[PDB]
Amino acid sequence: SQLSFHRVDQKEITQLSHLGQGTRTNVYEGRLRVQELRVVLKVLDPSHHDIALAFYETASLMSQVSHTHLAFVHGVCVRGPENIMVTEYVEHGPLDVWLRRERGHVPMAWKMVVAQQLASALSYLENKNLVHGNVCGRNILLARLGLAEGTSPFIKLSDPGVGLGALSREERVERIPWLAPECLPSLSTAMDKWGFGATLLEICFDGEAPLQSRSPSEKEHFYQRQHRLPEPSCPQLATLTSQCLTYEPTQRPSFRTILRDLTR
Ligand SMILES: CNc1cc(Nc2cccn(-c3ccccn3)c2=O)nc2c(C(=O)N[C@@H]3CC[C@H]3OC)cnn12
């Protein structure tokens, strides 16, 4: 009753190559006939009704927002028990993978453009009072490389996939340190300030995230002990990442402050 998205007919979609896995999903290159548009198909695992609902809730969220740095959702194809989200194909793929592959020739200026674009997407959702809840390098898609002389990068933040509210505690621990600490045991836009902070660290460290090596027990203990995440060596950027990565959600800065700080 609360939800609104386009139903996509199975006859309108073609599934091409496998691109990877998301949370409870397999992602394929596809075609959507509307013209034969390149898209990605996100195929939900066999799931309980509650996970399918959480999937529809994400489709509904993304279908009623617009921003140049938010990826487009075309709709959902049902096929009895099978659920497919149809979403924007973004040329150069996930940023975390891209950064790890390009390690050693991504300049700071390039990274600062990406942080500004992500901040302008999250400023828009803050103003709408809508939670993304899965801000991370994997969900930042690179539309334009921006490494050539006289070019700049262009990103699209992916749909967050299955809503965080429907995932297991095990899955939430796996998402440390992108997971806001209040989300371990909380659905406020404040969680995206933390995720933003974690994603800046991830970008600064060329797609290596802090804590990623550590076991689930050690990731959970980090949060229980309110250990501080590492500060990048650029102190101006450290002040910002630290303010975002504040355990008390009400002490994290607005995206007005964040954008102000990034733009000088
Ligand atoms: C070239 N266009 C494109 C490639 C690609 N690729 C990938 C996807 C998911 C994992 N992986 C992956 C595969 C091995 C190792 C690490 N990551 C990938 O490469 N995803 C996308 C999306 C897209 O929305 N993705 C989002 C990123 C999470 C996935 O929703 C679950 C759009 N366009 N595109």
Q: For each of the domains in the chain, give its residue range(s) and CATH number, in order of start.
A: 10-88 (3.30.200.20), 93-263 (1.10.510.10)
Ligand 1 centroid from CA 93, angstroms: 6
Q: Nearest residue CA, atom 10 of ligand 1?
A: 20
Among 17, 18, 19, 26, residue to substitute to test ligand 1 (most atoms within 8 Å of Cβ): 19
Burial (CB count <10 Å: 0-12, 13-18, 19+), residue 261: middle
Contact 154, 117 (CB under 8 A): yes
Q: Is the CB of 24 under 6 A from ligand 1?
A: no
Write down how long the chain is: 264
Distances (CA, A) of 206 to 2, 26, 111, 170: 40, 25, 9, 26
Answer for the pair 40, 19: CB distance below 8 angstroms, yes or no.
yes
CA 28 vs CA 21, 61, 91, 156, 201: distances in Å: 9, 22, 13, 18, 29
Angle between helices 108-128 and 190-204 (to 10 degrees): 170
Q: What whole-number distance in Å separates Cα of residue 24 and Cα of residue 160? A: 12
**Structure method:** X-ray
Nearest to 124 by CA among 244, 255, 264: 255
List the resolution, Å. Answer: 1.8
Contacts of 262 (CB under 8 A, 6+ apart): 112, 115, 116, 119, 240
Tokens of 264: 């000088």
9, two tokens: 């007919």
CB-based contact 42:58 (threshold 8 Å): no
The residue whose CA has the least distance to atom 31 of ligand 1 is 22
Q: 254 to each of 2, 114, 117, 130, 131, how far by Cα in Å?
A: 28, 18, 15, 14, 14
- The answer to whether 34 touches 75, Cβ cutoff 8 Å, is no
SS3 readout for the chain:
CCCCCCECCHHHEEEEEEEEEECCEEEEEEEEECCEEEEEEEEECCCCHHHHHHHHHHHHHHHCCCCCCECCEEEEEEECCEEEEEEECCCCCEHHHHHHHCCCCCCHHHHHHHHHHHHHHHHHHHHHCCCCCCCCHHHEEEEECCCCCCCCCEEEECCCCCCHHHCCHHHHHHCCCCCCHHHCCCCCCHHHHHHHHHHHHHHHCCCCCCCCCCCHHHHHHHHHCCCCCCCCCCHHHHHHHHHHCCCCHHHCCCHHHHHHHHCC
Rounded Cα distance, 21 and 201, in Å: 23
Is residue 13 within 8 Å of residue 78, measured between CB atoms?
no
What residues contact residue 3 under an 8 Å CB cut-off, 6+ apart? 56, 57, 59, 60
